[PDB]
A paper describes a structure:
Glycoprotein 130 (gp130) is a signaling receptor shared by interleukin-6 (IL-6) family cytokines (or gp130 family cytokines), including IL-6, ciliary neurotrophic factor (CNTF), cardiotrophin-like cytokine factor 1 (CLCF1), leukemia inhibitory factor (LIF), oncostatin M (OSM), cardiotrophin-1 (CT-1), IL-11, IL-27, IL-35, and IL-39 (1). These cytokines share a canonical four-helix bundle structure in which four major helices (termed helices A to D) are linked by three loops (termed AB, BC, and CD loops), as well as three conserved receptor binding epitopes (termed sites 1 to 3). IL-6 and IL-11 signal through gp130 homodimerization, while other cytokines require another “tall” signaling receptor, such as LIF receptor (LIFR) or IL-27 receptor subunit alpha (IL-27Rα), which forms a heterodimer with gp130 for signal transduction. The extracellular domains (ECDs) of gp130 include an N-terminal immunoglobulin (Ig)–like domain (D1), a cytokine-binding homology region (CHR, D2D3), and three membrane-proximal fibronectin type III domains (FNIII, D4 to D6).
LIF forms a 1:1:1 tripartite complex with gp130 and LIFR, and the signal transduction does not require a nonsignaling alpha receptor. As with the CNTF and CLCF1 complexes, this map’s higher resolution around the interaction core region (LIF, gp130 D2 to D5, and LIFR D2 to D5) permitted full model building and refinement, while the density at the distal domains of the receptors (gp130 D1 and D6, LIFR D1 and D6 to D8) was sufficient for domain placement as rigid bodies. Of the 21 LIF residues forming the contacting surface, R37 and H38 from the N-terminal extension contribute the two highest fractions of buried surface area through electrostatic interactions with gp130E163,E195. W164 and F191 of gp130 also engage LIF analogous to how they interact with CNTF and CLCF1. While gp130 largely covers the middle region of helices A and C of CNTF and CLCF1, it is positioned toward the N terminus of LIF helix A, leading to an increased distance between the bottom centers of gp130 D6 and LIFR D8 in the LIF complex (~34 Å). LIF is primarily docked onto the saddle-shaped LIFR D3 through its helix D and AB loop, with additional contacts made between the LIF BC loop and the N-terminal loop of LIFR D4. In addition to the key residues F178 and K181 in LIF helix D, P73 and K80 in the AB loop also make extensive contacts with LIFR.
Numbering used by the authors:
A (entry chain A): 124 to 515
B (entry chain D): 34 to 202
C (entry chain B): 132 to 533
The structure:
């Protein structure tokens, strides 16, 4: 039972340590064998690699590795009957070098720019011998699949790189590995992950808000209630500091408030007014919305017809026919009719083009909800309508 | 030359990279040597570690490639012998240092590799068959201070000649 | 009358340039003076054109009116290769039975020695080893003017000599490093220097005790005291010698990264039963020694048993059999076998076993329970109380139950 040629002659070199070459086993041959690896500089040879009997996997070399010097390596196996040698290869140990991953990755944010970030790292000690190429993958704070950076950019030895086209106030994680430039060689391990954070340039388009009014409290004096929703932590682009709303009309009123909360109670007159809400951040130059409060006595002003709300499925879908030619927006309200207790209402804003949508709240089962749709026009809201509908 | 099997073809780029690495390692080794030698040495470098040796193989840049390779072979043989002697002397005198010995061993290994490469190239290209090499005495002994001074001057001359050879080839 | 002694003559003068000392010899003309009168000899050592550096006196007496040679030596503080040195002698006889006045005799004719340049070295001495704190003077002979000199980047002042030579007096030197401090003399275009070594005497080796693993050899170790600050060919060399027999072994300092404590091999001699060792230490500055007497029988340290099995016949429970190398065919053993129950208790018992050849041993047991998750462990001692042997690999081979 002569052992077959130990072919496939795999081999790998490691940076800072000695190299090692592999082979194929073949059949069991039911006999003990000792693989004797060889080395040849074409001028002078060295000691033969003796595979340890406990784990004869690759090799156990003893000479230091030198680059830019070819060497011929082959495997020699022999059992009690027969002798056979494997094939020979001539390779350069500088190509099989497996570099080390970069260390101490740093991330710093830019001033006034949220998309532009900076990435700095430290190249290993092998940068002086060979030319390194990098491969960087980035993802958000919570992502399953990483995003691949085009390798055409990081194709040369560089110490820093700048990332752009990024969303504001989004933390990102980076990692990098390096290998030889010409593509010949094994990739290095992945470096340590470094977190980062973008800037807080400016909030979103507009913090939409809706007004609430009571009837005449004391002979024409009515209280107004201003409420607005909280912008999610992806459009505000930074921590919310305070809200700022301005109101002025009728040649005499001009006020400004910096209430931290959403609810503020101010007593106004019967005359019309113009609302303007801004949300100030640590940077500034925020955006402004608008709202028109109607006058004292207004008629129905084009009420809504054909209102419906129904199950099927899992969310009450409201729908209505198209209103008249002039419609600004729809802001419908709803509450639950609880026995022996009043109801508090919620609200949401819809665009003028949309005629059917689903409400977003915390409704429960086996309850009756009174959904009221208030059509908002140019000169004030119109006569609303109500309808009851179960959940399940 | 008793060549076992034919050589590679990129020997020129190989020896160029080896000469660059040799220049770098020689600069680093010289810095380490004149830093770890002693206190009065760095202050009087211009007089103690001058690049003047009583015997050293000359080099001609205007010469042909064959003559340049022969001169490089002679120079690397002399440098290997002198580096072995200096390493022995430094291991005898100061056994505490380890980075210096590691750099010396790495430089000797790279010198032997360059020697093998240039011998392979010269025997595969021009078929010189045999070369003429002259061996000398220890040229440094019986005096500790003279040993130190000769070693530092030799390392300075080696740094200079390797900085010249890095641009020559 | 005036009694004037005869002018003495210097027979021969010599010097040892290695240790920088002088050798003087002369023969008094005692055959002329029959009386046994007391005499006094004064020798003045004058250098650098009659500077009168030191003056000595030696009191002697004529040996029954005979002429015998007297030798006198002196160690100079400055190397003899730095300047010229003159020497003259004179005597003054004092007769107890003389009535007239006694004066001093004339000085001997001048006898000088001058070192002729035979080597290329210009600074003296070369590689000298002295005690820390000793006073030494360095000299640099040359043909050109010297600018300055410095050892510990100090630039100490320099003194002048007769011909174009300078010297520096460095008092109370400091401790040197692994390499000697360079005593350089900055010339106009060259630098000549040497090295000096300042080390401490070898400390007495403490903690000198040794046991034995087998009755074939002894391994006696120790630890040095204060570091002598001398590394290389001038380091200390410890040597262990025997008192009664006289055999000796030498330790080797080949490899540089040495261990903390130095062991030493000493083969046991047949049937001695008594060992009285005496360790020696050598150094170019001093020496120390320390003796110790031990009883090799009681100073024994057994080895841990290896390659032992746990099995027996279907009869009463396992009779162990461990292998212990060495030569103990004369003394007995006290291997205590510790049996452990199912993580509940662990009883102790010991049985005596006579020594055997370099092979395994045999023992017996008594009424061990069934499996009960039993485990085995052994640690051998000796009838002579000492450190117990190291534990071996625990085995839990159980004889069949039910
Ligand atoms: C990365 O920064 C750390 C400091 O946070 C440093 O790590 C030192 O690395 C050296 C050698 O690798 C060690 O001897 C030190 O113990 C490490 N820690 C410190 C605090 O110095 C170093 O500046 C950088 N290390 C790398 C590998 O890039
Ligand atoms: C010192 O000793 C030397 C001896 O080496 C003296 O030199 C001798 O001088 C006399 C006359 O001057 C000559 O006749 C001898 O031949 C010399 N001996 C030699 C050259 O070996 C020298 O005079 C003594 N004194 C001094 C001051 O040097
Ligand atoms: C020789 O010099 C050393 C130090 O240069 C002196 O050692 C000092 O001695 C004083 C008191 O004697 C101590 O207070 C210092 O702490 C010592 N310093 C050191 C570094 O040991 C030594 O005394 C000097 N010798 C003489 C005879 O004066
Ligand atoms: C070892 O035997 C000697 C007998 O020669 C004991 O006596 C010592 O002998 C040495 C000889 O160099 C002397 O230096 C010691 O002073 C002697 N010691 C005594 C107490 O007389 C020696 O004692 C024995 N060793 C021990 C440890 O007792
Ligand atoms: C050195 O050790 C031996 C062995 O332990 C001692 O010899 C023992 O002497 C006692 C007498 O007190 C006998 O009862 C033992 O049988 C002896 N053991 C033997 C012969 O193996 C010897 O006495 C010790 N030396 C000293 C000075 O105490
Ligand atoms: C063996 O060859 C195959 C190619 O089919 C591949 O797994 C590799 O190159 C070799 N593997 C080993 C372990 O030698
Ligand atoms: C390995 O096996 C071969 C079989 O030819 C044998 O000659 C050799 O002694 C064994 N051991 C070693 C270390 O090679
Ligand atoms: C609010 O208005 C008052 C009116 O005098 C003015 O002083 C103040 O600066 C204003 N605050 C902001 C934040 O505009
Ligand atoms: C009230 O405003 C302050 C800032 O003046 C700040 O603590 C926060 O915006 C508000 N407080 C709370 C408890 O939300
Ligand atoms: C409430 O409105 C009334 C108007 O009649 C007046 O007291 C004032 O404007 C408001 N008071 C408070 C405390 O807001």
């Amino acid at each position: 039972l002569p052992p077959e040629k130990p072919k496939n002659l795999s081999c790998i070199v490691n940076e800072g340590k000695k190299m090692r070459c592999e082979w194929d086993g073949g059949r069991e041959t039911h006999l003990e064998t000792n693989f004797t690896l060889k080395s040849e500089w074409a001028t002078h040879k060295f000691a033969d690699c003796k595979a340890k009997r406990d784990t004869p996997t690759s090799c156990t070399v003893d000479y230091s590795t030198v680059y830019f010097v070819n060497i011929e390596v082959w495997v020699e196996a022999e059992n009690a009957l027969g002798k056979v040698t494997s094939d020979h290869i001539n390779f350069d140990p500088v190509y099989k070098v497996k570099p080390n991953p970069p260390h101490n990755l740093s991330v710093i944010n830019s001033e006034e720019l949220s998309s532009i970030l900076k990435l700095t790292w430290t190249n290993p000690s092998i940068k002086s011998v060979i030319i390194l190429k990098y491969n960087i993958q980035y993802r958000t704070k919570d992502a399953s699949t990483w995003s691949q950076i085009p390798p055409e950019d990081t194709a040369s030895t560089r110490s820093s790189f700048t990332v752009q086209d990024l969303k504001p106030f989004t933390e990102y994680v980076f990692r990098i590995r390096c290998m030889k430039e010409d593509g010949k060689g094994y990739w290095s391990d992945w470096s340590e992950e470094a977190s980062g954070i973008t800037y807080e340039d400016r909030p979103s388009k507009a913090p939409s808000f809706w007004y609430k009014i009571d009837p005449s409290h004391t002979q024409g004096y009515r209280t107004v209630q201003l409420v607005w929703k909280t912008l999610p932590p992806f459009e505000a682009n930074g921590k919310i500091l305070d809200y700022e709303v301005t109101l002025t009309r009728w040649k005499s009123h001009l006020q400004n408030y910096t209430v931290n909360a959403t609810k503020l109670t101010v007593n106004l007159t019967n005359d019309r007014y113009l609302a303007t809400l801004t949300v100030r951040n640590l940077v500034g130059k925020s955006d402004a919305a608008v709202l028109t409060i109607p006058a004292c006595d207004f008629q129905a002003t084009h009420p809504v017809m054909d209102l419906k709300a129904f199950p099927k499925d899992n969310m009450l879908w409201v729908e209505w026919t198209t209103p008249r030619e002039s419609v600004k927006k729809y802001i419908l309200e709803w509450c639950v009719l609880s026995d022996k207790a009043p109801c508090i209402t919620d609200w949401q804003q819809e665009d003028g083009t949309v005629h059917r949508t689903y409400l977003r709240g915390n409704l429960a089962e086996s309850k009756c909800y009174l959904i009221t749709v208030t059509p908002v026009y140019a000169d004030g809201p119109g006569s609303p309508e109500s309808i009851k509908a179960y959940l399940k | 030359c008793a060549i076992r099997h034919p050589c590679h073809n990129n020997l020129m780029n190989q020896i160029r990279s080896q000469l660059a690495q040799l220049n770098g390692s020689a600069n680093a080794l010289f810095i380490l040597y004149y830093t770890a030698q002693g206190e009065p040495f760095p202050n009087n470098l211009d007089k103690l570690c001058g690049p003047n040796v009583t015997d050293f193989p000359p080099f001609h840049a205007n010469g042909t490639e064959k003559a340049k390779l022969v001169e490089l072979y002679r120079i690397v043989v002399y440098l290997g012998t002198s580096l072995g002697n200096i390493t022995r002397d430094q291991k005898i005198l100061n056994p505490s240092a380890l980075s210096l010995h590691s750099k010396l061993n790495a430089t000797a290994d790279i010198l032997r590799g360059l020697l093998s490469n240039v011998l392979c190239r010269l025997c595969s290209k021009y078929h010189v068959g045999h070369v003429d090499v002259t061996y000398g005495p220890d040229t440094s002994g019986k005096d500790v201070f003279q040993k130190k001074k000769l070693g530092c001057q030799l390392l300075g001359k080696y740094k200079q000649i390797i900085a010249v050879l890095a641009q020559a080839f | 009358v005036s009694l004037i002694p005869d002018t003495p003559e210097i027979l021969n003068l010599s010097a040892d340039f290695s240790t920088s000392t002088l050798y003087l010899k002369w023969n008094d003309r005692g055959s002329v003076f029959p009386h046994r009168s007391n005499v006094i000899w004064e020798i003045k050592v004058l250098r650098k054109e009659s500077m009168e550096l030191v003056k000595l006196v030696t009191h002697n007496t004529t040996l029954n009116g005979k002429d015998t040679l007297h030798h006198w030596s002196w160690a100079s503080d400055m190397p003899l290769e730095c300047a010229i040195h003159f020497v003259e002698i004179r005597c003054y006889i004092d007769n107890l039975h003389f009535s007239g006045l006694e004066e001093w005799s004339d000085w001997s004719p001048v006898k000088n020695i001058s070192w002729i340049p035979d080597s290329q070295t210009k600074v003296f001495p070369q590689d000298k080893v002295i005690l820390v704190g000793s006073d030494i003077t360095f000299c640099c002979v040359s043909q050109e003017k010297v600018l300055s000199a410095l050892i510990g980047h100090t630039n100490c002042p320099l003194i002048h000599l007769d011909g174009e030579n300078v010297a520096i007096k460095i008092r109370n030197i400091s401790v040197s490093a692994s390499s000697g401090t360079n005593v350089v003399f900055t010339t106009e275009d060259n630098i000549f220097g040497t090295v000096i070594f300042a080390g401490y005497p070898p400390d007495t080796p403490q903690q000198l005790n040794c046991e034995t693993h087998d009755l074939k050899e002894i391994i006696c170790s120790w630890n040095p005291g204060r570091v002598t600050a001398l590394v290389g060919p001038r380091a200390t060399s410890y040597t262990l010698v025997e008192s009664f027999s006289g055999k000796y072994v030498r330790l080797k300092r080949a490899e540089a990264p040495t261990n903390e404590s130095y062991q030493l091999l000493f083969q046991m001699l047949p049937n001695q039963e008594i060992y009285n060792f005496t360790l020696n230490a050598h150094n170019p500055l001093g020496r120390s020694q320390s003796t110790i007497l031990v009883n090799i029988t009681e100073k024994v340290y057994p080895h841990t048993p290896t390659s032992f099995k746990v099995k027996d016949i279907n009869s009463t429970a396992v009779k162990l059999s461990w292998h212990l190398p060495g030569n103990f065919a004369k003394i007995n053993f006290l291997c205590e076998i510790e049996i452990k129950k199912s993580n509940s208790v662990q009883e102790q018992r010991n049985v005596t076993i006579k020594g055997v050849e370099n092979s395994s041993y045999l023992v017996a047991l008594d009424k061990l329970n069934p499996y009960t998750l039993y485990t085995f462990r052994i640690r051998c001692s000796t009838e002579t109380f000492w450190k117990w042997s190291k534990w071996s690999n625990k085995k839990q081979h159980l004889t069949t139950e039910a």
